[model samples]
Target chain A: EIQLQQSGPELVKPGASVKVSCKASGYSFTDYFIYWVKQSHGKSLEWIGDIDPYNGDTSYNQKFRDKATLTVDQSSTTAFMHLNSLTSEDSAVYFCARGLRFWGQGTLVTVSAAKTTPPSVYPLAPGSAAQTNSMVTLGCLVKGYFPEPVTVTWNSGSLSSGVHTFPAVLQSDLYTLSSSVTVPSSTWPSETVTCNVAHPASSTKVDKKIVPRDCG
Target chain B: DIQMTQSPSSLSASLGERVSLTCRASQDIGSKLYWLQQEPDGTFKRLIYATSSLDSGVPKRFSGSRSGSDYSLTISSLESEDFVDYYCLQYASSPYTFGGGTKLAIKRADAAPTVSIFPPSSEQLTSGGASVVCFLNNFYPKDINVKWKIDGSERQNGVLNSWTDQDSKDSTYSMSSTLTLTKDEYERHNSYTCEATHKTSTSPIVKSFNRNEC
Candidate 1:
């Protein structure tokens, strides 16, 4: 039975290094080449490179040129990948693959010093603008955030119930957050609501005034 | 790196049948192409390298060849294990690429040889001599070998083996070997052994009989 067994997960500090191994078996080790791939959290796959086991020849993706080093130990039928200068961005799962189709289970690498960019918030209201005596919903569109664990609060003249938030969704490398509240129609155009975004970067608020459709 | 275009995409074949898969290079690769097999469980194994050379441990029934810019992997006589997905890769330059791949499935199993031994009759078992017949029946591919052993020592003399004409309708073949022994040889020999070797068997099919009992 052909098999590729991979290494375990790793946790390292920023600027530190980590090495992973994949052991190949059930055939001539030097008869085929082995490849590596990187899959970041919520991101697509990236082909790292491949190495010929017969000779020590190697080829790498330009994106991983300086970040990854590929080597082999034909004597043991194993391949190795060394990653250096780690950061939160380097936190992802790595896979040792063969034939561009078969892959080993991935190994997770966690890098400390977790950092993230705060989100940009935009306050929104029902309709193009606010309309009095109609159902008015207050919300905010928050996008482009990273390294989650964020909190968004909706506040106004009087804190009340029925306020809800959607779970942050990931797109590319950033998280998009959003939340909304429902206010009584009779109280529309006289009340104001605020969207408060909290993250490691800072706490900020955007106040949206309730107004008629023609007001703003 | 060169691009490889593999064809047929998928096919179905029966045991002992012949099948060929081809990979065409976008340009001249000069025999740098290799054939890889992907098993059902998603493991890739190298089968052929340098266009026509079999990778280590690969069976002789599986062969590779080249024609102009195209390379091919052929199974002269398919075995159960030959039914799998195959891929072609070119390593002539950087950023190597692979052909899409071809999947082979088993249509049915053909006949595999059934072997037996026939010792001499009681009247012919005297010290004057004996004749042992090793019979192989209903096999395919028409290629097989039968070896004789006297008391564990290989003996080529006094052994005659021949294959019968294959049944064209089914492509099944039969073979038999006769080993003659002199009175002194039969009395001195502890056992007579017949080993039948074929492409489909990892080890030879062997049957041994005690000369005294015969």
Candidate 2:
């Protein structure tokens, strides 16, 4: 019977900040820690940090060190996330999940009057395949995505097959990431591999194919 | 962070048999422990959380229960796909840690091994040389034998078999064998076969493939 209710969407102005709330009911709020997650537009889930409602102790993901602030109100049984320095890239959906298992409804934070562009997805290089065996390596690079964090994934292939090297030296406030997958070479001529890049500012995704000729 | 200790690092069981996995926390964690099932391909699926509560999409047969500092995940009836690795995660502490994990395997008493041989890549097949991988999965007892054959002749060279890795959730062993082919052997279109001999089987299980199949 435990439930978490969250605040509504926000359309904040550039350079401003916003605070979102999540109300918990049907259980002892202090019994479990409340975790905050971020889902940037059409991107995947990112764990921002968590707060122990009973003790006010906090921990955050290293990436969100200065961006997000987590707090809890024991008397009201509510959890809050404070997002500062708003920009187009800061527009995303925030959620307060009970521990890491149960999640609340999302609160969309939209930044209006500011334009944030999605990252550009690039194809893999030629030396992505092994010469003697059927094992093939596919790498993709997403560059110049705004608002700090960007998620890169393979649309057609499994990213679990390899490693993702991220934060390729940020330049001018823009982020770059590289991800690779090493799969059996049987996927070369048959599988149409694609890399998807997403950011928090927009709903559109950047998809690029890893052309087979590039692997040769 | 709470510490987790799992029991029976490896187990082998028969189908439909009840299996129980336990995770003991160092202190009173108050139902902050969770159960996760990890597939062989490395994907994770949450099974139970809050100590004794089943996850939203978990099957009914999989249930969680806790007693004091010990948490348990029990499978009422084992299914074929239930064989996998299980891990316990305690989120009560600042830095969460997972148990070493329990490998569940199916006891291969009288069951035959399932084998899959990957077809050579088009590039390798056309280049007149290829390395093929043979996967033997879902067998029991950990004492099964895998041998390679070429053109009706037992070929020992160029064959490499990896050590058996146990599945902690279902107690079955999986192993793989690799065969290397030279340019002449690839161009000659010789037949390749993998033979698995197990103590549970009266006859050796053989799987064969030819160049045309690739």
Candidate 3:
């Protein structure tokens, strides 16, 4: 008889943001990690992430890093996820999911397919090719955020190793993380290249090995 | 909990094509598991489990096996009824994880709405064997479609079944889905696949197979 009751359906405009909720019954909220899952029109389910309702801890799928935020209030017996900068790709049935023990009835969030601002697109840095003192820039674009803009960094591999800044311009409710870096041309090819981005509560990292982009 | 992922959202299969489904754990899970199938206008039905054991009463065509960390569910041969959605479930943990489903339907590389396979296949039968019965564990009364076919022919699959429509806790909702099949060796390696297609466009979750019991 334990159940997951989600928030109501929502209809959002292109530029707005939306918040979805999952309420748990028949069990202590603290015992389970409530998660958020998304399925876009006819597409498969994508893991947004999960949050521990008691402690408010979270683990998100790298793909959904900044695009979603997970939180919970044990006292209220509720868990929630907020998705920002609505886009057609973001439009989907967002389910507040718990694992096999229980799957909550999901909630659907729809965004008008039309977007006022352009969606962020990152280049797949070519994978493994010879390098020659080549300087490369890696970028992750984030469209919208509240009062303060987001932070973007470039890393060779992990979070601590490398962080570089990119040039970004502020647009109406959103901003893009534009960053670049110059590498000393190398005689041997660099097999691994990675970029990391951090937002107020979430982070996303994209990496590609050195692809043979013609020498500068 | 183990997390599951399915590759390439959509696939096209022919009438007799053999189809396969794969599910992997986000990390290592020591094998508490089950599989489910969903078809257009159908309710989710449990398929395979413990890696290779067929859920009692399933057809002989649906078979499951494990290779390393990857678990596979394979249908010996596809039937029109096999056309539907397929999903993997992990019971290793309290919160079960389901793989993003794979919908099995005949497809043309064209751009039009996909067609569905209705009254999909049921259990196979021979001269003599044990009688098989299936009872859904967490049967949420979502409008579901159920059917059973002998050897390409429709039959009353519900030889014996039970239901508890009241969602133990929620007075607002209910749940139920059932099936029973008599076993026989003549149907050895033939097949039976069941599916539960949520009313949503996300393809129905499907599970197909051959009998695992000899």
Candidate 4:
């Protein structure tokens, strides 16, 4: 007994667009030509494209030819895939093949997207080859932003224990960040090191100040 | 005529032993070849067909054969559910391949693998690049040796291996490996290591990479 029946598990919401379904049963789905696979979550096994329920031909893998779009539906035997502009690298899991030995039992897709943008913050430089005879690094470059938990702080009653706030880089539709902190090169221009930011899609809060009288 | 080269990739048996898994082809795929078993909740059980035929219920002790460009399955006797994974797939060329599995466990297993490294998500570090992963979990004879170092060298290109060894059920085996960073290659690196080398250990399990536990 053969079976392909797949469809279920998708959340979508980000430039919106989704369509998935592969429902074949025990052979003869126009004599095969389904294929379409992608597994990204840990990556490996990509091959997103293939369709031809007998004379409708299509093929792609030129990196998913403009992000996938194969279709078919001959009398309810089913096979489809739309996925357009959904980002977060199109979530992932999708599978429905017939070649490497029949398959289809996967369809996860989960895009999420939507926090509404707000994060340009950039001005608190000096780190990496700028001043490190003993230690004194500081950086902050947020840029673009939308959907993500972002937070960074370094000023108040400083005691000691470096800092780093990276993790936010999707850049092709928002979000890019980099944060760092480390002192004791005799403690930065002698006082004044503020780089605070907080945005879950803004309400206003970002400090940025590494002043030492503009350390000529 | 594309590719499919299975071999001793793994095979130790002994719960009744009697193994002989081999596959080879690059040209004449005569009987179109076939044989699969996978199953540890991942599902697959076709055993053999077109090449040696025996897939109605699969259990004549599993068998299959050919001669020209090699191709075999042989089992005759070995049970405990025949010890996990096996695969051969070929379907006479024109894009189709899979010989990348043969695992069979129950011998060289002193077990040793529990590594863990995950750290990349925030929608995959907002999307430009950052993967990490590293899994490994329970292990036995599944032949593990994942690597992704940086201060200890060894990181040829973004590396990637995604669960090539599943079956962490009763007899043990599980895997994962991935490391793709960008964003200035993770701010020009500060830490990244996932070593893992099991053969029952000779020392090599390192885990490194904190990112302040994020």
Query: In TM-score terms, which candidate is top?
Result: 3
Give per-residue CA lDDT, model 1, range B1-214, as digits (tens): 4678898687767888999999999988888887878665445567888888887789999999999988899999988778778888787865666777787765534555665555443334443655566656667555688888888999898665555533434446666666767666677777778898887777998877664442
Per-residue CA lDDT of candidate 3, range A67-171, in tens? 888888777788888888888577677767564335665666766643333323243232223332353322232333322234544453343321233334333
Per-residue lDDT value at B84 in model 4: 76
Residue A65 shift from truth in candidate 4, angstroms: 22
True contacts preserved, each candidate? 0.01, 0.00, 0.05, 0.00
- How accurate locally, in lDDT, is each candidate? 0.70, 0.69, 0.52, 0.68
Model 3, C-alpha of B159: deviation from truth (Å): 50
Listed per candidate, the RMSD to the true structure in angstroms reads 35.8, 13.5, 27.4, 17.4
Candidate 3 displacement at residue B152 in angstroms: 45
**Model 1 chain A: worst 10 consecutive residues (lDDT sum):** A207-216
Off by over 4 Å in 2: A1-97, A103-216, B1-3, B8-17, B26-32, B35-70, B75-86, B100-109, B114-125, B132-176, B181-197, B201-214
Model 4's i-RMS, to one decimal, reads 14.5
The collision pairs in model 1 are none
* Chain B TM-score of predicted candidate 3 relative to the true chain B: 0.49
User: Per-candidate TM vs. native?
Assistant: 0.37, 0.38, 0.40, 0.28
Give the per-residue lDDT of model 4 (tens digit) for B35-54.
87765544555678677988
Better of 2 and 4 by lDDT: 2
